[PDB]
Design a protein around this ligand. Structure first.
Ligand SMILES: CCC(=O)SCCNC(=O)CCNC(=O)[C@H](O)C(C)(C)COP(=O)(O)OP(=O)(O)OC[C@H]1O[C@@H](n2cnc3c(N)ncnc32)[C@H](O)[C@@H]1OP(=O)(O)O
Ligand SMILES: CCC(=O)SCCNC(=O)CCNC(=O)[C@H](O)C(C)(C)COP(=O)(O)OP(=O)(O)OC[C@H]1O[C@@H](n2cnc3c(N)ncnc32)[C@H](O)[C@@H]1OP(=O)(O)O
Ligand SMILES: CCC(=O)SCCNC(=O)CCNC(=O)[C@H](O)C(C)(C)COP(=O)(O)OP(=O)(O)OC[C@H]1O[C@@H](n2cnc3c(N)ncnc32)[C@H](O)[C@@H]1OP(=O)(O)O
Ligand SMILES: CCC(=O)SCCNC(=O)CCNC(=O)[C@H](O)C(C)(C)COP(=O)(O)OP(=O)(O)OC[C@H]1O[C@@H](n2cnc3c(N)ncnc32)[C@H](O)[C@@H]1OP(=O)(O)O
Ligand SMILES: CCC(=O)SCCNC(=O)CCNC(=O)[C@H](O)C(C)(C)COP(=O)(O)OP(=O)(O)OC[C@H]1O[C@@H](n2cnc3c(N)ncnc32)[C@H](O)[C@@H]1OP(=O)(O)O
Ligand SMILES: O=C([O-])C(=O)[O-]
Ligand SMILES: O=C([O-])C(=O)[O-]
Ligand SMILES: O=C([O-])C(=O)[O-]
Ligand SMILES: O=C([O-])C(=O)[O-]
Ligand SMILES: O=C([O-])C(=O)[O-]
Ligand SMILES: [Mg+2]
Ligand SMILES: [Mg+2]
Ligand SMILES: [Mg+2]
Ligand SMILES: [Mg+2]
Ligand SMILES: [Mg+2]
Lengths: 347, 347, 345, 344, 344
């Protein structure tokens, strides 16, 4: 790992100074779109208004022959639009691919000053970050980019999971991680073709019952370990953790349950793959109204944030005050964008 | 990490020789109390007789205007009391706080010889342990303290979780870890104000059954990964793992369930925050009666702990013998201290 | 770790060149047997035809006074048998035991060319692998063994769990890990005498219900973290992860459930401790017929594996194609060996 | 090592923000003095005028029965003296000693805002730094100290040498290292009672031909070379410590000059007579500066190639010249007598 | 590294408890001998009384057809000889060799209770130590060896040099290192066939003035310095190995003395004539001892400052004096002339 004094130095003469703190903004939903699709490209300004984060996709789900068209279409649509409060991301192709050199180079060259975050897929170790870091720096210097483009690592290989700490601390550009359950399941050899959510085969069988009686089967979460480890490593490095894609577009109930699990565990947001998933992500990664109301009571009960208090037979202290603050701070930020939430939150 | 031949050397001339083995004693319940509260302080010698471990608290839940009074109150009651077989701990203030230097110094000066374990909150890395170890050594030398004061690390930050191995191996003073789910939730940004236990928002949704409305929702353990990792790292380093606080004081059913989960995963004990939680912790972290009996039958079927056997259609061998021995060894040392459990097992 | 340019060098003059890739073969079931039992030994050649892997056991479950007999028994049944497609493993005694030196030396001497994998119990760190690697190499050189004997590490100590990465990367002999739930519980101090499976005491209690209706209690998986970590570390190092023993031989339903959880999480196979467990492991650690069918639909929807597609409301792309490929490739591989799975798949 | 974003955070609420860059100042000579000696103490403000750095000594060479007197003496003289451009250091007792807790606490409490650097003796590993860093932070917060007190590690154990990288990166307080050849020789078991300098027993015998030449070798080459690399790689400074033979000024100067050539910033003086030796040696030689100027002139933009007296110059030799000239320039503004000799 | 609480545990049930501290004894000379050569084997009990350490050699210099003869010869002479206070070592064959398994197993089985130290050649990393440590434990348990056989690592590969720290901390059996300049030169590709000592081609050419002076340099400075630091940091001892030029005793003494100065405990002797050279060189010089006694007498408690012969002394030089005088006492305890020479 790099020395702290060198960690914050630009990797190229003319490259912008590395940031010390991550930009604070709502990131409840990261909306993916295929930039090579004209009808979708046409409604981008409309969509951008309704999402915290917009992410152009160049990698998986983009057909091999459409790669160049996706890259160009992203550049085309970005040059045309003012995204305002909406964050702009892009997932370029893999580091071993014949498209990645031009993806990064041409995008930075054209719209580098509008690009907030670049997502790198199939990350396996800190060496991957080292390349992207130095490559971006040289491109930023060449094209006079005013602020550093951040790196978001898609967490979707067994290697990536094992090397998570090393990846997280590899660069000041690091923004966070997205769990990619599809590639990760394939890499691990998890015997499923689903993308997130539960699986009926994973459960605990109860002991034999009093008199022959049928045995309850309790489904378990496939992703507990993975999300928990991702959150810990990310947060410890000052980064953010995201749930990635939920593949079953039509099963909105399961999407919500999976999103909510991630939110509870400490994830900032999730991807949306279609318009229907957009309100699900925003609704889930906004704190529940009852959570906020009770949190406000904790903050009020201990105004200085120090000491002890009892609310409804539940003990409160300095720590629960900090828990409440996390919820309320987030709720406050969001309430500025959604009138109805502000009304519900009273913030 | 220090070399083995230096690891066991005292860090100050006149400081007592570092321990090679942790003291063997029941630690089923760690009872917290606020030392600045006269009404509670007056009953302390009475409470001490009913707990395996008594722990004064100077950190969170103590109002900032009562910090010095709490420190003084703790010292006062300790000086006046013979704790007998009851272990004495204290949770001092955080390493970044204006109270910590005096917390440790005054407690060692006045009652260092009575103090078994010091609990350090908000631990982030091995550097924290290094400071406390060297500080304790110099204070022990200063006051001719006869046995080393051990260090118990409160596990309640994201950095602490990630650096757990390095923390565990940083000192021969290390006693173990307590899970602090309130600060840990806040640190990770887990979206709850609860302190331990289940959450109705975290669960797995069953698949949609065509023609049926009900989709079972199976609640999941928020703390599986956390406790499992804590237990592995602690035990691998010869240390003990504990569950910390259960915040919902009145929900004794949920408290017992949370305590029992920790016990099953290998935790030695849990904190009690009020008298009602004392019998719960003692009951849970004492091996259950039929568990002991079946273990006793395993030890009988293989007197030397070597070979194979079947009991009730269940295969037994050297390893299940070791499993039984763990349960039976624990039952014995509790029975020596607890009269009611002495007869419930066999003594 | 050793340097890459030394990692693949033999540790003794005359020892065979280290493998670069793990041998590809079905390993759905690892059948354990006590080699000192003549009755069982006589049936071994028959049993071997039904299992992917046969593993002789010299360690736990073998009485002290039978250690020598078990070692000789294993050697003798191996000398007399052509196992064919069945892989041959042996679990020797622990590295601190008075039997391990002779276990490894005598087995290599007599049947080293027939032994595929040696299982080492109670592994604690990379130092354990370093000893076995170097000892095996000198024995291989001594008896001119033609291919490297692989090391399978039993994962059954807290130290082993914590040092898993180092153990995994310690030798080119590494084959994989088996979860040893019994010793691991005893090592951790998990308060149970059960060997795998659920425990009724481990669950999440629901919130107070309303008019104080009984509070639902949801049992949890004791082994989730353990198996998940084993799978990640193994696969990242190019190794395979296995569920070990399920101690309740009579409870076939709980056995199958435990086996299936391991399979879902990425485990390659499980142990069988008795013949009744053999078909359970083979059934579970083969992809379910419905899994394969939907997987085939995915592969068919975009044969080059590059693009996007919708199937039954579920979105598909390059990654789900790779998921399907994992399932289909394993399906075909087993089908060529397990006749029922050819027509069915 | 700590994470970068946490590395630069104060370790106590109210402690001053950790520095990102080391203060720039001449540090050619670090003058040691026993603060418990009244006659020395009385002469302190005069001696301070002619040294770059003044360092009070509480550790070795201070008798056990004088430890507290030394502590109080240091505090007394510091409170009463305006040191000006002279940096103020103190070498406290070892981390295992019965004096160190009070050494650090009482000095920080009384004169922390005047203390630039604290020297810790017999450092063995990063854990030592972690303790001092956290201790200082809490003391700094308690007494509202305005700037961070830096940590200078005495390199004088074999363990410290082996753990040099870990020590160097342990804290943003790190200032640098001093070689303590006496303790280091004893730690290693180097069979000499000398403190720095050469030893006639260390040398290479030529092949037979008559009379075989015996070439003396530098005992300290490896040690100083390693110290400089580790120090410089971490943005720290490396120092030669004491030269024990106070009277042998020729050998002192030779040892000092070796350290300076290898990259050391300065050396200790243990007596007034060593003061001008250190200042002379750790200031660039006049001919070194002159030739460096020739290089800077032949390379007005610092890039390209050139030839001076059969010696090839380029971007790198320009940087070498810049190191020389920049140092000469900084010293010149502090020393008028060197300004015209240098021509700066 | 292993955890501290497991580091000191026997690796086999029945193996003796690992040592916490190295045995204290003179180890100035490590005398090598080919145990297969009969006429040498008959003089062993005589030579044994004249050396601090006797080391049988089974590896390099022993021809292949004599490997088994060497092993058997070692066992035979050890069985018959009471070595008294002379240490008994054996250098077995390399870990990749067809001889090592039996070298270790048979020797432990036959004379394990007389064997103090086993030397492992061609060590490349901690994995080598791990194997030998575990192998020995299982052999010790089987044959009921009462005290642990220690491991001495021959430092003679580039990889060994680089992994020195990991090797040093790999086992409580570790005794120390010997520099093997022959294999190390071949391993590094140092362009010479000499075994230790100087080389006329390695030197520094002075600037033009007259004929330019050429100062020969020590090939082994870095190597020995690094070995000493790593060894001592882990509480181990460093040794110089073979000086291959048996007849050039002056060059041998010079090489040996360089090692002694840098901190090496002893050296190997390959022939009878090297025995007195090693014993002489690795015993403290009389003047070193006499001067070290004055420092100890000047500061009886080892605290404070003093002044002798214009040389300043303090706690640190007292410690240096202590290193020298302690060693002298041990040697004087079995050598009357040095006792009277040293005046103890
Ligand atoms: C598993 C590992 C991974 O890599 S997941 C990440 C990669 N995946 C993606 O980005 C997938 C994005 N989604 C899509 O491409 C489309 O949703 C696909 C799957 C092709 C479906 O196309 P289509 O059949 O037109 O959907 P539809 O009839 O339901 O759409 C209705 C209207 O919505 C639009 N729409 C659809 N998706 C998006 C989107 N991501 N962003 C913006 N608009 C979208 C459609 O174009 C359609 O628009 P309109 O009503 O016709 O104007
Ligand atoms: C979550 C993050 C954390 O840091 S948790 C760890 C820090 N927290 C603590 O230590 C909390 C300690 N507990 C307390 O201060 C009290 O229990 C609080 C929370 C204030 C509740 O007080 P109270 O409402 O009086 O409880 P209660 O009604 O159950 O009291 C019954 C009787 O027992 C006493 N009591 C109470 N707590 C303790 C205690 N910890 N130790 C000893 N005695 C205790 C009460 O004084 C009361 O006495 P009585 O019935 O009036 O004779
Ligand atoms: C938990 C920690 C660990 O170390 S577990 C790994 C170590 N344990 C083992 O290897 C256990 C091996 N298994 C056994 O010893 C037996 O199966 C035990 C468990 C004792 C049960 O014996 P039993 O009750 O007779 O089994 P069964 O009724 O099912 O016998 C049916 C026929 O099959 C035979 N059989 C039994 N076990 C095996 C075996 N492992 N391999 C091959 N054959 C086996 C029985 O002898 C019986 O034979 P048959 O019909 O009479 O010809
Ligand atoms: C080797 C391992 C280590 O720890 S070295 C670092 C620790 N040692 C030290 O700090 C040594 C400091 N020096 C001293 O104590 C003295 O210089 C000692 C060694 C005692 C020698 O005294 P002396 O013979 O009087 O020296 P000298 O002839 O050069 O003195 C001439 C006049 O100079 C004065 N002087 C001496 N040292 C200092 C000093 N460090 N700072 C200021 N003034 C000093 C002396 O007082 C002396 O005049 P006077 O007749 O002593 O009054
Ligand atoms: C360079 C890399 C390495 O591996 S060095 C470490 C391995 N080398 C060794 O151990 C070499 C040991 N030495 C020897 O074998 C001999 O000294 C060699 C070099 C072969 C020369 O033998 P030779 O010429 O017969 O010796 P010499 O005439 O000088 O001896 C006179 C009397 O001394 C004897 N001697 C000789 N060497 C030893 C010895 N190492 N130990 C005991 N005795 C030795 C000779 O036998 C001779 O005795 P005697 O007069 O016949 O009773
Ligand atoms: O790309 C992804 O997000 C995946 O593989 O799940
Ligand atoms: O301090 C604690 O125990 C916590 O935060 O849960
Ligand atoms: O040996 C085993 O497999 C175990 O202990 O579970
Ligand atoms: O203190 C010192 O500088 C020494 O020991 O050389
Ligand atoms: O074996 C040795 O000592 C050598 O190679 O120099
Ligand atoms: Mg993917
Ligand atoms: Mg807390
Ligand atoms: Mg086992
Ligand atoms: Mg010193
Ligand atoms: Mg050699």
């Amino acid at each position: 790992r790099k020395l702290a004094h060198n960690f914050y130095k630009p990797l190229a003469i003319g490259a912008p100074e590395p940031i010390r703190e991550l930009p604070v903004r709502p990131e409840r939903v990261v909306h993916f779109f295929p930039p090579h699709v004209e009808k979708i490209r046409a409604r981008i300004p409309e969509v951008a208004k309704q999402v915290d984060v917009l992410c152009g996709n160049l990698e998986d789900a983009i057909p091999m022959d459409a790669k160049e068209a996706a890259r160009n279409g992203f550049i085309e649509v970005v040059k045309a639009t003012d995204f305002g409060d909406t964050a702009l991301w892009v997932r370029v192709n893999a580091l071993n691919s014949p498209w990645v050199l031009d993806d990064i180079a041409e995008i930075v060259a054209a719209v580098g000053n509008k690009l907030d975050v670049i997502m790198i897929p199939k990350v396996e170790g800190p060496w991957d970050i080292h390349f992207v870091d130095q490559y971006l720096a040289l491109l930023e210097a060449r094209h006079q980019i005013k602020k550093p483009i951040l790196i978001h690592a898609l967490l979707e290989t067994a290697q990536g999971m094992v090397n998570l700490e090393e990846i997280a601390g590899a660069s000041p550009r690091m923004h966070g991680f997205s769990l990619g359950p599809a590639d990760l399941a394939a890499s691990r050899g998890m015997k499923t073709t689903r993308v997130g959510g539960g699986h009926p085969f994973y459960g605990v069988l109860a002991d034999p019952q009093e008199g022959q009686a049928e045995r309850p089967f309790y489904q378990q979460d496939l992703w507990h370990y993975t999300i928990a480890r991702m959150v810990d490593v990310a947060v410890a490095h000052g980064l953010r953790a995201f749930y990635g894609p939920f593949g079953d577009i039509k099963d909105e109930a399961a999407c919500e349950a999976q999103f909510r699990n991630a939110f509870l565990l400490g994830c900032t947001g999730a991807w949306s793959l279609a318009p229907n998933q957009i309100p699900i992500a925003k609704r889930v990664f906004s704190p529940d109204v009852n959570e906020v109301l009770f949190a406000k009571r904790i903050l009020e009960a201990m105004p200085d944030g120090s000491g002890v208090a009892m609310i409804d037979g539940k003990m409160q202290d300095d720590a629960t005050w900090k828990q409440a603050k996390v919820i309320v701070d987030l709720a406050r930020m969001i309430a500025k964008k959604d009138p109805d939430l502000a009304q519900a939150y009273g913030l």
